[PDB]
């Protein structure tokens, strides 16, 4: 682990506004962005694209031949951002849990030099508490300036 784990507190309505700002301020080579349902993966990818950014998405409601080709394109550096649900790429230096995961196991799969930013809503609080204790480690409120040494290669 060379991952630095932050959270931002948001409501659902602030999520896109929040991400767009992370898209501007972080120095991203590639990002992976996790949501909690295939519907939301699609909506967000569209949102990201309308805001002016490059964007692939994968989820479970796709043919495997199709999911695997997109994932391979992404691995090969043929897009900047990938929105996905749950399943490293060296160029990925930032991971965003647009939707906070529900189990420590699932978090570990998403987080396993990089940054992992969590979007925490009032409704994510028992999961945050439970996931922290279960892994030992704390997820610190997102600072005003993050040290490029922590996630930029």
């Amino acid at each position: 682990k060379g991952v630095t784990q932050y959270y931002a507190y948001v409501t659902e309505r602030q999520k896109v506004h929040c991400l767009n700002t992370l898209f501007s301020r972080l120095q991203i080579n590639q990002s992976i962005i996790f949501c909690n349902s295939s519907q939301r993966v699609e909506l967000l990818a569209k949102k990201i694209s309308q805001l002016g950014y490059s964007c692939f998405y994968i989820h479970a409601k796709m043919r495997q031949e199709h999911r695997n080709r997109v994932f391979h394109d992404f691995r090969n550096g043929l897009c900047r951002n990938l929105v996905c649900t749950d399943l490293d790429i060296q160029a990925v230096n930032v991971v965003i849990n647009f939707d906070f995961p529900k189990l420590a196991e699932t978090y570990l799969h998403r987080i396993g030099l990089g940054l992992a930013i969590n979007l925490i809503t009032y409704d994510d609080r028992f999961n945050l508490k439970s996931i922290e204790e279960q892994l030992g480690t704390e997820i610190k409120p997102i600072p005003s300036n993050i040290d490029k040494s922590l996630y930029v290669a």
Partner: peptide
């Protein structure tokens, strides 16, 4: 969709993480 920065700091304090974790533990 504001062409302006999201206020992380302001929204961080809407939520007292220590207070909340203390309460749930009781």
């Amino acid at each position: 969709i504001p062409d302006t920065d999201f206020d992380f700091e302001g929204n961080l304090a809407l939520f007292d993480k220590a207070a909340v974790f203390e309460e749930i533990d009781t």
